[PDB]
Amino acid sequence: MEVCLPNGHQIVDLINNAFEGRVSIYSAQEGWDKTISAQPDMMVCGGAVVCMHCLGVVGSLQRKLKHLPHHRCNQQIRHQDYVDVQFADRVTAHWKRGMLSFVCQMHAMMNDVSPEDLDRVRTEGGSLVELNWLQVDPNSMFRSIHSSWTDPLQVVDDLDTKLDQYWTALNLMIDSSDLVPNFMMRDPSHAFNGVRLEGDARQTQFSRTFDSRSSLEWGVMVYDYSELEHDPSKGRAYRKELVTPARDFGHFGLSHYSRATTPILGKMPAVFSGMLTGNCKMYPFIKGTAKLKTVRKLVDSVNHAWGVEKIRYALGPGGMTGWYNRTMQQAPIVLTPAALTMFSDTTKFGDLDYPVMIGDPMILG
């Protein structure tokens, strides 16, 4: 056996899928499965098949593998060296299911509207549908304390498909109706920095990162649209005229800005792409530079494990360190789903007029 070490691009690729929850991993206990936890042995990286315990190039795409033959290994790789990545993706699975079930609940509630009250609100405004956040999946690590990352996951299929269906249907029903909920955002940059806080919101802090060093179990933070409904000088007419995100995005069938909500799960506000690209997609804002910070200990370890020739020949000039820094330059763009630039920049009802606090979810006009 003559194992080798891969190249930068595929590493970035693996980094991305880590925040994409789409990596194919093998584990004889689970084989392909990842619903439950167990140590890994081989993983894919930008199209390559790698050992997880000598981290050598053991294959690629055009040929699948089924089991590990006796190969030339080093067995110097530890769990904490990589626990971070499957850690983050287990987080991904959690949070994706959470936002998913959220959407399911929301469209289900929407799936109950009758025309009479409908027209009454259209003529009047006010609340239409309200939801209790306490009853929203306590089992989630965003909602339970005895739970953990390692907890085996829940099985669903074509989550993307159903997601898009329901985001589509729901926001279209709103579009026809032109309502305004207190849990949506036009510039989520404000969320972790750029918002006004009030009430127990004075007590929330920010890590901006996947970190077991922060509790993500938490309530859900929304606007204060109560007085908004109360405001007669900005009444039903005005309410339609300025606050409807058609002002901020136009038709939901005219998607050219990305659509974000408040920090729903674990203080995380996610955004939606535009279907006029073919389809819409949810994404939690994650800084690529953080993902860079992850690989640092690995740089060290490999410095310690392997020779200068290989790194000049595997991660090239400046070694993987020069790779680190040049990629560190490249980051703000090479790490960018397009929605990361689909932002809106004019709110026509103001936002620092309304604080954010943990209350019961709802949509009003």
Numbering used by the authors: 1 to 365
Task: Kindly provide excerpts from the paper associated with this entry.
The particles harbour 10-separate genome segments and comprise two principle protein layers, the innermost composed of 120 copies of protein λ1 clamped together by 150 copies of σ2 (viral polymerases, λ3, are attached inside adjacent to the icosahedral fivefold axes). The outer layer consists of 600 copies each of μ1 and σ3. The array of μ1 and σ3 is interrupted at the fivefold axes by pentameric λ2 turrets which enzymatically cap the mRNA transcripts produced by the polymerase on egress from the particle. Here we demonstrate that vitrification of infected cells followed by cryo-focussed ion beam (cryo-FIB) milling and cryo-electron tomography (cryo-ET) allows high resolution reconstruction of assembly intermediates of a mammalian reovirus, allowing atomic models to be constructed which throw light on some of these fundamental questions.
In addition virion-like particles of two types, ‘empty’ and ‘full’, were observed. The two virion-like particles are extremely similar, with the exception that the density level is much higher in the interior of the full particles. For stars, analysis focused on the fivefold regions using emClarity16 yielded a reconstruction at 6.6 Å. For the empty virion-like particles, reconstructions focused on the fivefold regions and pseudo sixfold regions yielded reconstructions at 6.5 and 5.6 Å respectively. We believe that cryo-ET of suitably prepared infected cells will be a general vehicle for understanding virus replication-cycles in atomic and molecular detail, with our study already providing a reconstruction at 5.6 Å resolution from only 65 icosahedral particles. If there is indeed some similarity in the assembly process, with collapsed particles being transformed into an expanded state by the recruitment of the RNA genome then the empty virion-like particles we observe would be dead-end products that have failed to package the genome. Indeed the proportion of empty virion-like particles observed is consistent with the known ~50% failure rate in packaging observed in strains which do not organize their virus factories in association with cellular microtubules.
